From Swiss-Prot:
3',5'-cyclic GMP binds at residues 68, 269. Residues 1-312 form the PDEase domain. Plays a role in signal transduction by regulating the intracellular concentration of cyclic nucleotides. Can hydrolyze both cAMP and cGMP, but has higher affinity for cAMP and is more efficient with cAMP as substrate. May play a critical role in regulating cAMP and cGMP levels in the striatum, a region of the brain that contributes to the control of movement and cognition. Homodimer. This is cAMP and cAMP-inhibited cGMP 3',5'-cyclic phosphodiesterase 10A. Abundant in the putamen and caudate nucleus regions of brain and testis, moderately expressed in the thyroid gland, pituitary gland, thalamus and cerebellum. The chain holds residues 724 to 1036 of 1055 of the full protein. A divalent metal cation 2 binds at residue 107. Belongs to the cyclic nucleotide phosphodiesterase family. The tandem GAF domains bind cAMP, and regulate enzyme activity. The binding of cAMP stimulates enzyme activity. Composed of a C-terminal catalytic domain containing two divalent metal sites and an N-terminal regulatory domain which contains one cyclic nucleotide-binding region. A divalent metal cation 1 binds at residues 72, 106-107, 217. It comes from Homo sapiens. It is linked to Dyskinesia, limb and orofacial, infantile-onset: An autosomal recessive, early-onset hyperkinetic movement disorder characterized by axial hypotonia, dyskinesia of the limbs and trunk, orofacial dyskinesia, drooling, and dysarthria. The severity of the hyperkinesis is variable.
Length: 313
């Protein structure tokens, strides 16, 4: 009950900042997550015994893939923590509980392959879930772990509160399907500009939470350049493996996934920042002004990729 998690001074301070890197010490990541839950939600919103058992079962169900791994899970949860802490009064108690857990669970049992590859392979999951294939699987895996004995961290919620939080988690995880992001941001952009955006409108909150999930999911583009540059390697290690597997199915992959077209990565990143990341954090900053540091860091990284192209690194 009176058991706080405390971090070393440097982590205690830097964890509050959007550009925090959770570090290479895997065994500190569970504690970093509990620290964030306690400060974001309260020392009381989860039974520590059940939370710790939930965290370790979630960890076990992430795979040893270069990017879509346990470190990504905790990194995405931290970005959500920074958004929630900088927008204290805008989110309900249930939302704060739901979203940190949604972020931790959002890529559960990822194999390092896109929805497109599953469909072209004809993976069983592509028959079970025709769209947002991996994302429906991630939510399914979340519910499965919540239903392990001693793993239901929501046990002390009322029946209606329980249905609400599982609904928040389901929408949040589905929203991490980047195919759904483009239309979601366009709608949010229209609503902000015409002035129809209303956070008391549940369908509008859903859209804003969706964008927050995209923003947290892409947050490797909001780190200091050395973190962004080195994480880029990990995402491209997966892309190139998927490209190899496309060639094994007799299909030329998109250049992004072709390890023979490694030369084209810098220009591929410009496209990604301009088409996905910058628009995402711009719309997020308009809706939630205190998330501006994510947009600023993203612009800095765009400028670093421009310097790579100009041979200045
Ligand atoms: C349209 C297009 C072209 C090329 C690439 C791309 N996808 C991504 N590229 C890079 C990152 C990334 C990760 C970590 C650090 N820095 C960058 C990333 C992260 C998440 C999802 N997608 C991507 N999309
Ligand atoms: Mg995902
Ligand atoms: Zn993710």
């Amino acid at each position: 009950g009176l058991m706080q998690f405390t971090l070393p001074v440097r982590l205690c301070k830097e964890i509050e900042l959007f550009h925090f890197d959770i570090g290479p010490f895997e065994n500190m990541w569970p504690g970093i997550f509990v620290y964030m839950v306690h400060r974001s939600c309260g020392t009381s919103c989860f039974e520590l015994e059940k939370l710790c058992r939930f965290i370790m079962s979630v960890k076990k169900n992430y795979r040893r893939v270069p990017y879509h791994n346990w470190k990504h899970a905790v990194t995405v949860a931290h970005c959500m923590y920074a958004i929630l802490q900088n927008n204290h009064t805008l989110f309900t108690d249930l939302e704060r509980k739901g979203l940190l857990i949604a972020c931790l669970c959002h890529d559960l049992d990822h194999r390092g392959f896109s929805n497109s590859y599953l469909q072209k392979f004809d993976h069983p999951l592509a028959a079970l879930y025709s769209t947002s294939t991996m994302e429906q699987h991630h939510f399914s895996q979340t519910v499965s772990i919540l239903q392990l004995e001693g793993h239901n961290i929501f046990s002390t919620l009322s029946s209606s509160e329980y249905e609400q939080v599982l609904e928040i988690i389901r929408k949040a995880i589905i929203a991490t399907d980047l195919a759904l992001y483009f239309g979601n941001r366009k709608q949010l952009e229209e609503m902000y500009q015409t002035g129809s955006l209303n956070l008391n409108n549940q369908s509008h909150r859903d859209r804003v939470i969706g964008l927050m999930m995209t923003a947290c999911d892409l947050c490797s583009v909001t780190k200091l350049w050395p973190v962004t540059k080195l994480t880029a390697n990990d995402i491209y290690a997966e892309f190139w493996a998927e490209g190899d597997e496309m060639k094994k199915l007799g299909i030329q992959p998109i250049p992004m996934m072709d390890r023979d077209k490694k030369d084209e990565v810098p220009q591929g990143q410009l496209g990604f920042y301009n088409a996905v990341a910058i628009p995402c954090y711009t719309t997020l900053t308009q809706i939630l002004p205190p998330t501006e540091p994510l947009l600023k860091a993203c612009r800095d990284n765009l400028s670093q990729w421009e310097k790579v192209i100009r041979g200045e690194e």
